[PDB]
Design a binder for these strands. Structure first.
Ligand SMILES: [Ca+2]
Ligand SMILES: [Ca+2]
Ligand SMILES: [Ca+2]
Ligand SMILES: [Ca+2]
Ligand SMILES: [Ca+2]
Ligand SMILES: [Ca+2]
Ligand SMILES: [Ca+2]
Length: 112
RNA sequence: GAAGCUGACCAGACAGUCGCCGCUUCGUCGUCGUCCUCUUCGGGGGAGACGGGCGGAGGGGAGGAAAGUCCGGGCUCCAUAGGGCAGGGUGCCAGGUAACGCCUGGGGGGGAAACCCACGACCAGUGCAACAGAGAGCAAACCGCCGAUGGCCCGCGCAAGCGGGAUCAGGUAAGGGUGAAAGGGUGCGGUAAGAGCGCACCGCGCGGCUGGUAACAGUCCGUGGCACGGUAAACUCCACCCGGAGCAAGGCCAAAUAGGGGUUCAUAAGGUACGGCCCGUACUGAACCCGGGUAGGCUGCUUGAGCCAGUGAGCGAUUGCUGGCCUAGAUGAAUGACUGUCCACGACAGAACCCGGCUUAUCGGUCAGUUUC
């Protein structure tokens, strides 16, 4: 299966703080990923995109929609991490293809 | 058939699989902590709630601006002798509406480029221009004013007929005159070259009078020979109205240490609400010592001062009847990919308790009007 259940989301601020204490890190000039190993036996993810880097609400929502997808469509191929994903200033004009071509070569860095 | 502009609908459609979030409903599970029947005390359809209780199945899910921080209103909690003061708003006339700083029709501004109106007071001081004397109306008559208008000047012969003087700005005032900006026109022996200065006909006042719902309007009847220019997005007055906060408002069900004193003020203090500020006016209340909880869930929540259709009333804004009708509500916070046709080859952009306006953003269509090729 390739569902994306509530159980797979970092729902609370403490869960963000934990991965920031000990992150393994990968990122481009525009987009970046942090993660720590976890005991739950499957991956998890949490999103934050700064209103400072990406203005107007139709944008940001696009970056959520596309990045939530590229996680669940790869769910079984990376270790049982807890992950955080954050947008730098330079993302807000990349087309849907231009995020998706990057997130693959970004996850190709996670040789752990 | 040649350019805009106003109004309309719209700014994408359908099919495949891979998913996200609620709705409805069927059995599934716990539980009975309702009890129908009350039993076998299982809990049976359980009478009944709720949780993945759990699996189906059906049927749904971003605006005309959802943007803004701007005006009006609901709802809820809180505050409230109020007599002043302070501080914001709104200022032709009628109507609409639940209310507005919104809408409609009229009046007056221009009712055209007024296809546009911050449409009460112009005096209570002050600033007209920068520059005037044109600075509020101030007054250099600018060429006159000598115009013999006066004096008196003196030269004409005593001059009395002729020139000058400007005398005293010189009947001016703004007759007339360049210089800016200007307190009535245009005429008439306007008389010394002259003016409401007299006298026509117009202004313009102020009072009648006829229209109007009323702003207002009419040479329609008297009129003063007549008496603020302009400007309050100018400081001024004048009239009327103005109490906080936010859906994590608020409940309800929970969950809990409320423990010498206090700031021994007494007495009442001075604390704080009235209240920005004073005047009362109310309440009395102890700078904390002797302080932990809750940090949850349910509800408020999507039915709207709504929509549609048929028929009355109205110049319009709107609105009276009589039939119907309704699956965004999330809570790290709910919409991707492949394909083949539209070109409009797809702009600006998004919900957060809800309803009425206004403002701002916006590739481009296709219609209907309406001024133009
Ligand atoms: Ca649309
Ligand atoms: Ca808003
Ligand atoms: Ca509260
Ligand atoms: Ca709610
Ligand atoms: Ca919130
Ligand atoms: Ca509305
Ligand atoms: Ca509204």
């Amino acid at each position: 299966k390739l569902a994306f259940p509530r159980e797979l989301r970092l729902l609370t601020p403490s869960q963000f703080t934990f991965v920031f204490q000990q992150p393994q890190r990968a990122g481009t000039p525009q987009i970046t990923i942090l993660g720590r190993l976890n005991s739950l036996g499957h991956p998890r993810i949490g999103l934050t995109v700064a209103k400072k880097n990406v203005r107007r609400a139709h944008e940001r929502n696009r970056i959520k929609r596309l990045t939530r997808e590229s996680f669940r469509l790869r769910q079984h191929e990376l270790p049982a991490m807890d992950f955080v994903v954050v947008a730098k200033k330079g993302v807000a004009d990349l087309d849907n293809r231009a995020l998706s071509e990057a997130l693959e070569k970004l996850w190709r860095r996670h040789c752990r």
